[PDB]
Amino acid sequence: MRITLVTDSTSDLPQDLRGRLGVRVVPLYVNLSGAIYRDWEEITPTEIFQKVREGAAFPTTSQPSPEDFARVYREALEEADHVLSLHISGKLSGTVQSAELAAQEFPGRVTVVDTQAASLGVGMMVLRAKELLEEGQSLEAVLAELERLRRDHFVRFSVATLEFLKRGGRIGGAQAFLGTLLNLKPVLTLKEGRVEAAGRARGEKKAREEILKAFRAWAEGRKRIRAYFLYSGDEDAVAALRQEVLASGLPVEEALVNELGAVIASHTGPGTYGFYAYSL
Ligand SMILES: CCCCCCCCCCCCCCCC(=O)O
Numbered sequence: 033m034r035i036t037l038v039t040d041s042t043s044d045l046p047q048d049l050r051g052r053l054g055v056r057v058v059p060l061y062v063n064l065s066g067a068i069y070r071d072w073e074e075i076t077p078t079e080i081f082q083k084v085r086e087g088a089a090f091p092t093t094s095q096p097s098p099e100d101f102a103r104v105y106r107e108a109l110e111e112a113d114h115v116l117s118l119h120i121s122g123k124l125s126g127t128v129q130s131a132e133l134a135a136q137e138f139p140g141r142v143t144v145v146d147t148q149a150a151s152l153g154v155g156m157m158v159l160r161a162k163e164l165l166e167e168g169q170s171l172e173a174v175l176a177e178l179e180r181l182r183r184d185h186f187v188r189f190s191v192a193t194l195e196f197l198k199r200g201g202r203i204g205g206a207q208a209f210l211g212t213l214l215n216l217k218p219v220l221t222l223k224e225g226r227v228e229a230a231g232r233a234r235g236e237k238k239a240r241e242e243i244l245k246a247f248r249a250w251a252e253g254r255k256r257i258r259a260y261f262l263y264s265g266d267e268d269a270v271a272a273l274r275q276e277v278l279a280s281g282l283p284v285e286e287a288l289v290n291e292l293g294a295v296i297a298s299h300t301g302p303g304t305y306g307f308y309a310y311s312l
Protein backbone atom coordinates (compact mmCIF):
# COMPACT_ATOMS: atom_id res chain seq x y z
CA MET A 33 0.00 0.00 0.00
CA ARG A 34 0.94 3.66 -0.32
CA ILE A 35 2.73 4.73 2.84
CA THR A 36 3.55 8.36 3.59
CA LEU A 37 6.18 9.41 6.13
CA VAL A 38 5.53 12.12 8.69
CA THR A 39 7.98 13.39 11.28
CA ASP A 40 8.42 16.48 13.47
CA SER A 41 10.82 19.40 13.04
CA THR A 42 13.25 18.09 15.65
CA SER A 43 14.35 15.40 13.18
CA ASP A 44 16.55 18.24 11.83
CA LEU A 45 16.58 17.01 8.22
CA PRO A 46 18.01 19.32 5.53
CA GLN A 47 15.42 20.71 3.20
CA ASP A 48 17.12 19.10 0.27
CA LEU A 49 16.26 15.65 1.45
CA ARG A 50 12.94 15.91 3.17
CA GLY A 51 11.18 17.94 0.55
CA ARG A 52 11.84 15.78 -2.49
CA LEU A 53 11.37 12.58 -0.49
CA GLY A 54 7.79 13.47 0.41
CA VAL A 55 8.47 13.55 4.13
CA ARG A 56 5.90 15.77 5.83
CA VAL A 57 7.05 17.78 8.83
CA VAL A 58 4.99 18.91 11.81
CA PRO A 59 6.72 21.85 13.51
CA LEU A 60 7.59 22.29 17.16
CA TYR A 61 7.98 25.77 18.67
CA VAL A 62 10.43 27.90 20.56
CA ASN A 63 9.10 30.32 23.20
CA LEU A 64 11.43 33.31 23.45
CA SER A 65 11.20 37.04 23.85
CA GLY A 66 7.62 36.60 24.87
CA ALA A 67 6.82 35.23 21.43
CA ILE A 68 6.43 31.84 19.78
CA TYR A 69 8.50 30.82 16.76
CA ARG A 70 8.39 27.81 14.51
CA ASP A 71 11.44 25.62 14.62
CA TRP A 72 13.79 26.12 11.61
CA GLU A 73 11.50 28.58 9.74
CA GLU A 74 11.49 31.50 12.13
CA ILE A 75 14.36 31.15 14.58
CA THR A 76 17.90 29.85 14.87
CA PRO A 77 20.12 28.53 17.69
CA THR A 78 22.40 31.57 17.26
CA GLU A 79 19.51 33.96 17.85
CA ILE A 80 18.44 32.12 20.99
CA PHE A 81 21.92 32.19 22.50
CA GLN A 82 22.35 35.82 21.63
CA LYS A 83 19.24 36.62 23.57
CA VAL A 84 20.45 34.68 26.61
CA ARG A 85 23.80 36.35 26.38
CA GLU A 86 21.93 39.60 26.51
CA GLY A 87 20.14 38.65 29.72
CA ALA A 88 16.87 37.36 28.35
CA ALA A 89 14.83 34.75 29.76
CA PHE A 90 15.64 31.19 28.90
CA PRO A 91 13.97 29.72 25.87
CA THR A 92 11.35 27.08 26.36
CA THR A 93 9.82 24.81 23.79
CA SER A 94 6.39 23.30 22.91
CA GLN A 95 5.33 20.12 21.23
CA PRO A 96 2.73 20.11 18.50
CA SER A 97 -1.02 19.79 19.39
CA PRO A 98 -3.16 16.80 18.43
CA GLU A 99 -4.87 18.87 15.72
CA ASP A 100 -1.50 19.99 14.30
CA PHE A 101 -0.91 16.29 13.63
CA ALA A 102 -4.47 15.47 12.58
CA ARG A 103 -4.41 18.12 9.78
CA VAL A 104 -1.22 16.58 8.39
CA TYR A 105 -2.49 12.99 8.70
CA ARG A 106 -5.79 13.89 7.00
CA GLU A 107 -4.02 15.57 4.15
CA ALA A 108 -1.58 12.75 3.73
CA LEU A 109 -4.32 10.11 3.70
CA GLU A 110 -6.05 11.89 0.82
CA GLU A 111 -3.45 10.29 -1.35
CA ALA A 112 -2.03 7.51 0.73
CA ASP A 113 -3.31 4.36 2.47
CA HIS A 114 -1.20 4.63 5.61
CA VAL A 115 0.98 7.07 7.52
CA LEU A 116 4.20 6.11 9.28
CA SER A 117 4.92 8.86 11.86
CA LEU A 118 8.46 8.92 13.36
CA HIS A 119 9.29 11.05 16.34
CA ILE A 120 11.68 12.35 18.98
CA SER A 121 11.90 10.27 22.14
CA GLY A 122 8.76 10.13 24.26
CA LYS A 123 10.86 10.77 27.31
CA LEU A 124 12.15 14.00 25.90
CA SER A 125 8.89 15.39 24.52
CA GLY A 126 5.12 15.09 24.46
CA THR A 127 5.25 14.96 20.66
CA VAL A 128 4.66 11.19 20.47
CA GLN A 129 1.63 11.52 22.77
CA SER A 130 0.11 14.27 20.52
CA ALA A 131 0.74 12.13 17.44
CA GLU A 132 -0.93 9.12 19.10
CA LEU A 133 -3.98 11.19 20.02
CA ALA A 134 -4.27 12.39 16.41
CA ALA A 135 -3.70 8.85 15.15
CA GLN A 136 -6.91 7.76 16.96
CA GLU A 137 -8.82 9.87 14.43
CA PHE A 138 -7.70 7.56 11.61
CA PRO A 139 -7.93 4.11 13.24
CA GLY A 140 -5.89 1.56 11.39
CA ARG A 141 -4.22 4.12 9.21
CA VAL A 142 -1.46 5.62 11.24
CA THR A 143 1.50 4.02 12.95
CA VAL A 144 3.32 6.24 15.42
CA VAL A 145 6.91 5.27 16.25
CA ASP A 146 8.88 6.56 19.25
CA THR A 147 12.46 6.45 17.94
CA GLN A 148 14.01 7.09 21.36
CA ALA A 149 16.27 9.53 19.54
CA ALA A 150 16.59 13.25 18.82
CA SER A 151 17.76 15.56 15.99
CA LEU A 152 19.30 13.59 13.08
CA GLY A 153 19.02 10.48 15.26
CA VAL A 154 15.34 10.66 14.31
CA GLY A 155 16.13 12.01 10.85
CA MET A 156 18.41 9.10 9.92
CA MET A 157 15.62 6.65 10.76
CA VAL A 158 13.18 8.65 8.63
CA LEU A 159 15.67 8.46 5.76
CA ARG A 160 16.19 4.71 6.27
CA ALA A 161 12.43 4.10 6.28
CA LYS A 162 12.07 6.16 3.10
CA GLU A 163 14.90 4.24 1.41
CA LEU A 164 13.11 0.97 2.11
CA LEU A 165 9.63 2.25 1.26
CA GLU A 166 10.80 3.66 -2.09
CA GLU A 167 12.20 0.22 -3.02
CA GLY A 168 8.77 -1.09 -2.22
CA GLN A 169 9.14 -2.80 1.16
CA SER A 170 6.14 -3.48 3.39
CA LEU A 171 5.18 -1.61 6.52
CA GLU A 172 6.13 -4.61 8.56
CA ALA A 173 9.54 -4.94 7.02
CA VAL A 174 10.15 -1.25 7.66
CA LEU A 175 8.90 -1.38 11.26
CA ALA A 176 11.15 -4.37 11.88
CA GLU A 177 14.15 -2.44 10.57
CA LEU A 178 13.21 0.62 12.65
CA GLU A 179 13.09 -1.56 15.77
CA ARG A 180 16.58 -2.87 14.92
CA LEU A 181 17.85 0.70 14.66
CA ARG A 182 16.18 1.74 17.90
CA ARG A 183 18.01 -1.10 19.69
CA ASP A 184 21.28 -0.78 17.82
CA HIS A 185 22.64 2.68 17.07
CA PHE A 186 25.34 5.03 18.25
CA VAL A 187 25.31 8.55 19.64
CA ARG A 188 27.81 10.77 21.42
CA PHE A 189 27.76 14.51 21.94
CA SER A 190 29.31 17.25 24.04
CA VAL A 191 27.99 20.66 25.16
CA ALA A 192 29.57 23.90 26.38
CA THR A 193 27.47 23.81 29.55
CA LEU A 194 24.97 21.51 31.22
CA GLU A 195 22.82 24.52 32.15
CA PHE A 196 20.34 24.32 29.27
CA LEU A 197 19.81 20.61 29.85
CA LYS A 198 19.32 21.30 33.51
CA ARG A 199 16.91 24.15 33.17
CA GLY A 200 14.94 22.61 30.39
CA GLY A 201 14.59 19.36 32.31
CA ARG A 202 16.08 16.95 29.77
CA ILE A 203 19.44 16.53 31.50
CA GLY A 204 18.62 12.96 32.57
CA GLY A 205 21.69 11.02 33.69
CA ALA A 206 23.98 13.92 32.84
CA GLN A 207 22.91 15.30 36.19
CA ALA A 208 25.69 13.16 37.66
CA PHE A 209 28.15 15.61 36.10
CA LEU A 210 26.60 18.72 37.66
CA GLY A 211 28.41 18.26 40.94
CA THR A 212 31.36 16.44 39.49
CA LEU A 213 32.18 17.98 36.16
CA LEU A 214 34.13 21.02 37.20
CA ASN A 215 35.95 22.46 34.20
CA LEU A 216 36.09 19.21 32.32
CA LYS A 217 34.28 18.60 28.94
CA PRO A 218 31.25 16.29 29.21
CA VAL A 219 30.61 13.44 26.80
CA LEU A 220 26.97 12.40 26.67
CA THR A 221 24.76 9.80 25.00
CA LEU A 222 21.16 8.55 25.10
CA LYS A 223 19.95 5.19 26.39
CA GLU A 224 16.39 4.18 26.17
CA GLY A 225 15.54 7.59 24.87
CA ARG A 226 16.95 9.43 27.90
CA VAL A 227 20.17 11.44 28.12
CA GLU A 228 22.93 9.65 30.02
CA ALA A 229 26.53 10.35 30.96
CA ALA A 230 29.29 8.86 28.81
CA GLY A 231 32.55 10.23 30.17
CA ARG A 232 34.50 13.44 30.75
CA ALA A 233 37.76 14.73 29.28
CA ARG A 234 40.25 17.49 29.83
CA GLY A 235 39.97 19.58 26.74
CA GLU A 236 38.07 19.45 23.50
CA LYS A 237 40.63 17.22 21.89
CA LYS A 238 40.60 14.55 24.52
CA ALA A 239 36.85 14.69 24.39
CA ARG A 240 36.91 13.90 20.69
CA GLU A 241 39.32 11.03 21.35
CA GLU A 242 36.96 9.60 23.88
CA ILE A 243 34.12 9.84 21.46
CA LEU A 244 36.16 8.07 18.74
CA LYS A 245 37.18 5.41 21.22
CA ALA A 246 33.49 4.72 21.94
CA PHE A 247 32.70 4.77 18.22
CA ARG A 248 35.39 2.27 17.30
CA ALA A 249 34.18 -0.08 20.06
CA TRP A 250 30.59 0.20 18.79
CA ALA A 251 31.68 -0.09 15.13
CA GLU A 252 33.25 -3.50 15.46
CA GLY A 253 32.26 -6.00 12.86
CA ARG A 254 30.16 -3.56 10.83
CA LYS A 255 30.72 -3.34 7.06
CA ARG A 256 28.57 -0.29 6.24
CA ILE A 257 28.16 2.62 8.62
CA ARG A 258 26.19 5.83 8.08
CA ALA A 259 26.98 8.78 10.34
CA TYR A 260 25.15 11.98 11.02
CA PHE A 261 26.98 14.96 12.47
CA LEU A 262 25.37 17.82 14.36
CA TYR A 263 26.38 21.15 15.79
CA SER A 264 25.36 24.45 17.25
CA GLY A 265 27.74 27.35 17.24
CA ASP A 266 30.70 27.12 15.02
CA GLU A 267 31.47 24.07 12.98
CA ASP A 268 35.07 23.47 13.94
CA ALA A 269 34.65 20.99 16.80
CA VAL A 270 32.20 18.92 14.78
CA ALA A 271 34.35 19.34 11.65
CA ALA A 272 37.42 18.01 13.44
CA LEU A 273 35.33 15.14 14.79
CA ARG A 274 33.97 14.28 11.33
CA GLN A 275 37.49 14.38 9.88
CA GLU A 276 38.78 12.04 12.62
CA VAL A 277 35.90 9.63 11.89
CA LEU A 278 36.36 9.64 8.11
CA ALA A 279 40.09 9.04 8.65
CA SER A 280 39.59 6.31 11.28
CA GLY A 281 39.70 3.61 8.63
CA LEU A 282 36.19 2.51 9.61
CA PRO A 283 33.76 1.97 6.67
CA VAL A 284 31.69 5.17 6.94
CA GLU A 285 29.85 5.55 3.71
CA GLU A 286 27.76 8.52 4.67
CA ALA A 287 28.68 11.38 6.83
CA LEU A 288 25.94 14.08 6.61
CA VAL A 289 26.34 17.31 8.60
CA ASN A 290 23.62 19.71 9.70
CA GLU A 291 23.05 22.32 12.34
CA LEU A 292 20.79 21.41 15.24
CA GLY A 293 17.32 22.89 15.09
CA ALA A 294 16.36 25.73 17.42
CA VAL A 295 14.11 23.42 19.43
CA ILE A 296 16.87 20.89 20.13
CA ALA A 297 19.45 23.64 20.69
CA SER A 298 17.16 25.28 23.28
CA HIS A 299 17.87 22.23 25.44
CA THR A 300 21.46 21.32 24.58
CA GLY A 301 22.75 24.88 24.58
CA PRO A 302 25.71 26.55 22.83
CA GLY A 303 28.78 24.70 21.62
CA THR A 304 26.95 21.42 21.09
CA TYR A 305 28.50 18.90 18.70
CA GLY A 306 28.47 15.17 18.13
CA PHE A 307 27.06 12.57 15.82
CA TYR A 308 24.56 9.79 15.49
CA ALA A 309 25.28 6.63 13.59
CA TYR A 310 23.92 3.09 12.50
CA SER A 311 24.96 0.22 10.26
CA LEU A 312 23.32 -1.95 7.63
C1 LIG B 1 23.16 14.25 18.67
C2 LIG B 1 23.28 15.57 19.44
C3 LIG B 1 21.90 16.00 19.94
C4 LIG B 1 21.52 15.20 21.18
C5 LIG B 1 20.20 15.72 21.72
C6 LIG B 1 19.92 15.06 23.06
C7 LIG B 1 19.71 16.13 24.11
C8 LIG B 1 18.25 16.13 24.50
C9 LIG B 1 17.45 16.99 23.53
C10 LIG B 1 16.20 17.46 24.24
C11 LIG B 1 15.22 18.03 23.23
C12 LIG B 1 13.89 18.30 23.94
C13 LIG B 1 12.89 18.92 22.96
C14 LIG B 1 11.55 19.09 23.67
C15 LIG B 1 10.51 19.67 22.71
C16 LIG B 1 9.20 19.87 23.45
O1 LIG B 1 8.35 18.85 23.58
O2 LIG B 1 8.92 20.95 23.92
Ligand SMILES: [Zn+2]
Nearest residue numbers: 098099102137
Ligand atom coordinates in the same frame (compact mmCIF):
# COMPACT_ATOMS: atom_id res chain seq x y z
ZN1 LIG C 1 -9.69 16.12 16.24
